Amino acid sequence: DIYQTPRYLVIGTGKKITLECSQTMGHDKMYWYQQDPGMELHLIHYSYGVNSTEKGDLSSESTVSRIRTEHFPLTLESARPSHTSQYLCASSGLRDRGLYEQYFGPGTRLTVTEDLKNVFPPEVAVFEPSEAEISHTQKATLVCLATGFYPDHVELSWWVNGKEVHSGVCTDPQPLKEQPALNDSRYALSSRLRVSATFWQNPRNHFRCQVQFYGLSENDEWTQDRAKPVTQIVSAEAWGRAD
């Protein structure tokens, strides 16, 4: 398939950046796109094969290289806020019918920030179903709250009895900004897990809200005397309540 690393990247300003892109389908034509969240796909670079390198309809602070057919790394220069967005890698091979189909990678979500001192991991809390809901509907809704995080590099998941669930779960598509008047506002995100009342009333049932946070690496320089806001798991749990 086609691959991209990193998936998430937070970086201070003025620093060099390289976004890796690999493809093992043996495809010749490869592309790089930039997309602001909610906006169109702007083509920025592409390649025809081994040693081809061309620019797209948007010129940026960026270069690519195609040394090999497999790898198509992108380099972003002196890191500038503007880079904040998603970078999509793609390749097209002759699927059939005389036609080339495009295949896209998972993408890199980049945030560029003034100072890394603005990076903070989330806090996670779980809230138990109200008795009122239980009696009125015979259902039970847990709410999970992730708050106080920057940047928006988060993945929330629910684990019941140690297995991940998707049924009965809804996570906010977009996060909230704690203070929406500030450039580097921290974020909050909310999710619901809904189960039957009897399930909830079994005190053997175990519920976990897990938030994977993508932040700094251990290699990244930290001078802030607080815990380095490294990539980490923050979690919160509840148990069934007989009542």
């Binding site: 169109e40 080339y100 495009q102 998972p106 809230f127 138990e128 109200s130 906010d172 619901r192 809904r194």
Partner: protein, 202 residues
């Protein structure tokens, strides 16, 4: 742009059909595609059509092309929740390695549940005191109820979300409000919103 899409966005209930439109000025023309892009992910190719083909299907997705009038439509049958995504029309000028791709801005589609038996309520959710917060949950309202974000950097209101209890054949909408400040109570958490008259406030 040489590729324009219509409408900019629409919201439909599950069960219903809809039609997205693409018009282009790209010349010459070799083929047209429809991509589906889920939030936070990369587009997936749905369908490719050449200038001499009228129509191409992929499951409940059916694309139509009239190369004469430079117009394509994507028709979606029996919409479901997962159909919620951005749909992109892309046009290619030439049918080979040398062709360029032209991307429309895409159409945002949202698919809400069809809630026949609404039971709107605002519950208060305890546990924690882990958080010096109080969590309110507005739930079980039908899909016409609009949830408005409140304008207090103290009072946070999420937009509405659809949850699906697959094994019960049950779907529900919900919005979560909270605030650390003491001046806060679920009775007026959703005041800024027009909640139904019959909303259960326990």
């Amino acid at each position: 742009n040489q590729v324009e899409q219509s409408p900019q966005s629409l919201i439909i209930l599950e069960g219903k059909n809809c039609t997205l439109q693409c018009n282009y000025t790209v010349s010459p023309f070799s083929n047209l595609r429809w991509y589906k892009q889920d939030t936070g992910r990369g587009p997936v190719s749905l369908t490719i059509m050449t200038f001499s083909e009228n129509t191409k299907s992929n499951g409940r997705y059916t694309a139509t092309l009239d190369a004469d009038t430079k117009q394509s439509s994507l028709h979606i049958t029996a919409s479901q929740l997962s159909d919620s995504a951005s749909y992109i029309c892309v046009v290619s000028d030439r049918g080979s390695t040398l062709g360029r791709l032209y991307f429309g801005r895409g159409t945002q589609l949202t698919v809400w549940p069809d809630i026949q038996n609404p039971d709107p309520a605002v519950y208060q959710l305890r546990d924690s005191k882990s958080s010096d917060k109080s969590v309110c949950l507005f739930t079980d309202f039908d899909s016409q109820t609009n949830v408005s974000q409140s304008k207090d950097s103290d009072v946070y209101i999420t937009d509405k979300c659809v949850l699906d209890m697959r094994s019960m054949d049950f779907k529900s909408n919900s919005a979560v409000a909270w605030s650390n400040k003491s001046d806060f109570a679920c009775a007026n958490a959703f005041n800024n919103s027009i909640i139904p008259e019959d909303t259960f406030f326990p």
